[PDB]
Amino acid sequence: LAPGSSRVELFKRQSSKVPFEKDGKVTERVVHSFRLPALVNVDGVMVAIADARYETSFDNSLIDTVAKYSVDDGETWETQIAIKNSRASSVSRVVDPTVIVKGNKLYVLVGSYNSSRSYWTSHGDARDWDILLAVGEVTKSTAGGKITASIKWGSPVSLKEFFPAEMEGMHTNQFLGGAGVAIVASNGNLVYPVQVTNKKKQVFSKIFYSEDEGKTWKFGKGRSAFGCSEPVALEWEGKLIINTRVDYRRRLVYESSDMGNTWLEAVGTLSRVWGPSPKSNQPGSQSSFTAVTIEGMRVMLFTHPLNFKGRWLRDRLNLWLTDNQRIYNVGQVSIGDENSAYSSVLYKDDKLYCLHEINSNEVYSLVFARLVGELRIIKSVLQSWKNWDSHLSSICTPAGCGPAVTTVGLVGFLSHSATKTEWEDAYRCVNASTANAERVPNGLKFAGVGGGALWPVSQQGQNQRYHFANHAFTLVASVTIHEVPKGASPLLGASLDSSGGKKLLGLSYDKRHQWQPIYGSTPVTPTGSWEMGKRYHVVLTMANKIGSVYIDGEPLEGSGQTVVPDERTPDISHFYVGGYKRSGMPTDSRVTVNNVLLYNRQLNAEEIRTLFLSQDLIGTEAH
Ligand SMILES: OC[C@H]1O[C@@H](O[C@H]2[C@H](O)[C@@H](O)[C@@H](O)O[C@@H]2CO)[C@H](O)[C@@H](O)[C@H]1O
Ligand SMILES: CC(=O)N[C@H]1[C@H]([C@H](O)[C@H](O)CO)OC(C(=O)O)=C[C@@H]1O
Numbered sequence: 001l002a003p004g005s006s007r008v009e010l011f012k013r014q015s016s017k018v019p020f021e022k023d024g025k026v027t028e029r030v031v032h033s034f035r036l037p038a039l040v041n042v043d044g045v046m047v048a049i050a051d052a053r054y055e056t057s058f059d060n061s062l063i064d065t066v067a068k069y070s071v072d073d074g075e076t077w078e079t080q081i082a083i084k085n086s087r088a089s090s091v092s093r094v095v096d097p098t099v100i101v102k103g104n105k106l107y108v109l110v111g112s113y114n115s116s117r118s119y120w121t122s123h124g125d126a127r128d129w130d131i132l133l134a135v136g137e138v139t140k141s142t143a144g145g146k147i148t149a150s151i152k153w154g155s156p157v158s159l160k161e162f163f164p165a166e167m168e169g170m171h172t173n174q175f176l177g178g179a180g181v182a183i184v185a186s187n188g189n190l191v192y193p194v195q196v197t198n199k200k201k202q203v204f205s206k207i208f209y210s211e212d213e214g215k216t217w218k219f220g221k222g223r224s225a226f227g228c229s230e231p232v233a234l235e236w237e238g239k240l241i242i243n244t245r246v247d248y249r250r251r252l253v254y255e256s257s258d259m260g261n262t263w264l265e266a267v268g269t270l271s272r273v274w275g276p277s278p279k280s281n282q283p284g285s286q287s288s289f290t291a292v293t294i295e296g297m298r299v300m301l302f303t304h305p306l307n308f309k310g311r312w313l314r315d316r317l318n319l320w321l322t323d324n325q326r327i328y329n330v331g332q333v334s335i336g337d338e339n340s341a342y343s344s345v346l347y348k349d350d351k352l353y354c355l356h357e358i359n360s361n362e363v364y365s366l367v368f369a370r371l372v373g374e375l376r377i378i379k380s381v382l383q384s385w386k387n388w389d390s391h392l393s394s395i396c397t398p399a400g401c402g403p404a405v406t407t408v409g410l411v412g413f414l415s416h417s418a419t420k421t422e423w424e425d426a427y428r429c430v431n432a433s434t435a436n437a438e439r440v441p442n443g444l445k446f447a448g449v450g451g452g453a454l455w456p457v458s459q460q461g462q463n464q465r466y467h468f469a470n471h472a473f474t475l476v477a478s479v480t481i482h483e484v485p486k487g488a489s490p491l492l493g494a495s496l497d498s499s500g501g502k503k504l505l506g507l508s509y510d511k512r513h514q515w516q517p518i519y520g521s522t523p524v525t526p527t528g529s530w531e532m533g534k535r536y537h538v539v540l541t542m543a544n545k546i547g548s549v550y551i552d553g554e555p556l557e558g559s560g561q562t563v564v565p566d567e568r569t570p571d572i573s574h575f576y577v578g579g580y581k582r583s584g585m586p587t588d589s590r591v592t593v594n595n596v597l598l599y600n601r602q603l604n605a606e607e608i609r610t611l612f613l614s615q616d617l618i619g620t621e622a623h
Pocket of ligand 1: 057058059119312313
């Protein structure tokens with residue numbers, strides 16, 4: 001928890017009580033565990049929803065859906081049960097509650113079981129299952145001079161009639177919501193991401209929506225891959241963005257422009273970025289994922305635990321910030337090495353809060369946190385992004401001004417800032433490490449066996465922000481060479497292994513004053529010429545498994561070659577700059593490099609000429 005932020009234990013394990021109703025009688029009852037938190041804002045009133053696990057934390061036991069609410073931003077709360085289970089046996093339950101806010105109503109979706117003691121994904125049929133919808137109505141009043149509020153909960157309705165017996169190539173079994181909070185799309189529709197089983201017991205995700213305020217429901221035709229569960233969704237620039245959990249694997253994210261009729265993997269932005277454990281081979285988790293507007297810029301907020309300990313413990317809850325381009329680690333929200341899996345984040349009247357799980361010996365509470373510090377840091381990063389995007393967009397490029405320098409899809413920038421061992425990211429997400437570097441205006445100058453810089457890719461570890469590079473990228477720089485080499489030496493490139501011996505795409509130079517471009521594993525043909533002391537402009541592109549190299553804006557011989565054998569998907573290790581940064585490799589490069597830019601797509605020709613023509617104008621030096 002950052003400096004300046006604080007919390008309280010709100011749903012207190014083995015302490016807080018709720019109004020348990022049975023046989024027309026109501027009694028205040030102490031609860032063992034609270035889980036599956038969901039935190040929202042209804043027209044001025046804060047509401048918190050979750051699971052009340054009466055007797056034990058075991059998933060298949062006695063559970064009702066509880067609610068708490070406040071009109072003073074979290075100093076005081078009232079308590080109630082919003083949805084009760086069927087009362088048929090000692091293990092009846094309503095599970096995984098998923099919430100939508102619209103006008104002054106709360107729409108809550110839950111599964112309902114009568115008596116099974118087995119985990120739901122292992123049932124062979126639906127004999128014990130039902131799926132339901134309850135609506136709560138929120139009204140405000142002021143009797144006494146001070147604000148008040150009440151909430152009236154309606155009886156649940158089954159939506160079973162809207163589940164077809166068959167989908168494309170399978171037979172249906174059961175379905176449930178994805179937990180946490182869902183959304184109202186910009187056309188008015190109610191939209192719930194859902195998880196479904198079929199008769200072979202495989203799990204997968206769909207879109208489940210309503211056009212008549214929840215009176216009827218439909219399914220979109222498409223689906224995620226088998227193995228994706230507990231999905232969570234938001235709306236961005238006209239698409240639904242669906243974010244999934246996959247046990248024992250890196251997380252998959254999908255895009256859809258038509259209410260779920262067609263699904264496409266987000267290879268160029270967010271898919272495969274977040275892993276469930278340092279080696280990504282442990283159970284996954286539930287996540288909060290919303291779109292909000294801060295100081296006039298729209299952005300996304302996402303949380304997930306790092307799970308250093310393993311299995312289901314899921315310690316160290318982290319918060320991330322992104323604009324669908326750059327991706328920044330806000331930090332750790334939980335405290336110390338405690339266990340902390342599920343979570344919910346809310347932005348209200350310009351303040352940030354989080355409701356989340358804590359776990360000691362399989363006994364669970366929900367704490368409520370005021371994230372004053374997290375928001376401070378966020379605002380600082382958003383200003384820096386806005387400032388550098390504005391600076392670059394305002395430069396008068398030469399012919400009266402030519403076309404503008406592009407910032408769409410720009411991800412990283414290495415320029416004037418540097419310490420003794422790092423080259424700093426102007427966008428503040430990923431730095432590069434260095435050796436034998438001497439600082440100069442807007443760049444670095446290297447020399448000797450072992451010199452150069454390294455901008456990590458798969459080397460980032462658990463969470464990999466530049467995974468898009470395995471699908472498409474553009475890399476740009478200015479360079480000058482100071483000594484004719486003995487053999488062939490490296491200048492800039494993308495490497496598949498950690499030495500730099502297995503290249504995907506790169507550029508070197510040799511003793512006969514020629515360039516040596518390198519296309520994957522293809523045999524190397526030297527070409528063109530250069531003079532010492534002369535400044536040159538360099539660009540590398542890769543898309544659709546094809547790579548290119550430009551000098552001063554023009555493509556060299558051999559451009560247009562295959563860099564990925566149609567076989568698999570590349571796993572890039574790092575980009576190397578002005579050397580391999582490896583003492584064990586024999587080359588010695590004596591060169592200066594300035595202003596390195598990284599983009600998540602292949603640039604167009606006009607975009608390349610402007611960048612070339614405007615080299616002397618973009619450094620960060622004056623600021
Ligand atoms: O740690 C609590 C979680 O248990 C998970 O269930 C595990 C269970 O702990 C393990 O012993 C074995 O039975 O495999 C189960 C996975 O299906 C639940 O999935 C999770 O909801 C937590 O309750
Ligand atoms: C078991 C169940 O009905 N609810 C569980 C839920 C569920 O498995 C998922 O929503 C569908 O796979 O997830 C988890 C979990 O962290 O493993 C805890 C919930 O108690």
